[PDB]
């Protein structure tokens, strides 16, 4: 049933897209996954991107994969839509900008009127829709791959509509990108998946380099900062999630998933005063683990909830 | 055709209303 699961910008909302529509779940308690919204009028929803805890949502359906719909989900109204020359691979938004990622181009919209402010053309092919957008209005940067064969990151100022830097992050092509909440740090991983790096933004200085216990190569599918920027989680197509602590090389804490190979999305969220690792997995569950921010180590499972409600 | 005028007005009002936190 499920096609999509993702967290909003401050980890207060979980979106689950399915063949029959989509749902939002709040993330403010532990005992139950509390559904706050369900839509059944749109089929095969492959992208659902909420703006924080507002009523604005951007939706893409497999029935019209080149069309972005911007809606007021509580009222159930379509505000406007936009169609692109190729399929939409990712949508990112903050309080000032909405970014649409195609394989070969990026569109930067003013979210106040949905006008296109700038189009980045002929990007290196980006079939994964890999990109990241800062949630901070003062450091409003977009990151996307500057090469399809080397791990270079283009950093683009979405307010002033100009390039800020290009960062040689990894030798192999990029696999994952994430901004911290301040917009001044960018976490990066390559297709080899052996090193997670953190760079300052826009200066591009390497600040941290983390090893995932070495070993073999993984396909990193998710990087996520905690809201205070002290912790960074990295998940993959394996059973291990690593959590790094950005104090002045190796994992500070780990979690062992009950599966090996499903794609998943992680986030670091504080719920009822306790920092937690949330894992939305393709097996249809949300897993919640308790993180000890002083001791680390292996994190215990607190709850697992069905993503379908 | 100045029909763009009132639709753009409604657009901006509706986007601001939806984005209200």
Residue numbers in the entry:
A (entry chain A): 14 to 261, 299 to 359
B (entry chain B): 210 to 230
Please give me the paper's original passages concerning this structure.
The ATG12–5–16L1 complex is responsible for conjugating members of the ubiquitin-like ATG8 protein family to phosphatidylethanolamine in the growing autophagosomal membrane, known as the phagophore. ATG12–5–16L1 is recruited to the phagophore by a subset of the phosphatidylinositol 3-phosphate-binding seven-bladedß -propeller WIPI proteins. The two critical steps in autophagy initiation, PI 3-phosphorylation and LC3 lipidation, are connected to one another via a direct interaction between a subset of the PI(3)P-binding WIPI proteins and ATG16L1. PROPPINs bind to PI(3)P and PI(3,5)P2 headgroups through a conserved FRRG motif and bind tightly, but reversibly, to membranes using a hydrophobic loop in blade six that inserts into the membrane.
Here, we report the crystal structure of WIPI2d:ATG16L1 (207–230) complex at a 1.85 Å resolution. In order to generate a crystallizable form of WIPI2d, the flexible hydrophobic loop in blade six and the putatively disordered C-terminal region were deleted. As expected on the basis of the Hsv2 and WIPI3 structures, WIPI2d folds into a seven blade ß -propeller, with each blade containing four anti-parallel ß-strands. The ATG16L1 W2IR nestles between blades 2 and 3 of WIPI2d, burying ~550 Å2 of solvent-accessible surface area. The WIPI2d binding site for the ATG16L1 W2IR consists of a single deep groove with a mixed electropositive and hydrophobic character. Hydrophobic side chains of Leu 64, Phe 65, Leu 69, Val 83, Ile 92, Cys 93, Ile 124, and Met 127 on WIPI2d contribute to the hydrophobic surface of the groove. The surfaces of Leu 220 and Leu 224 of the ATG16L1 W2IR are buried in this interface. The side chains of WIPI2d His 85, Lys 88, Arg 108, and Lys 128 contribute to the electropositive character of the groove.
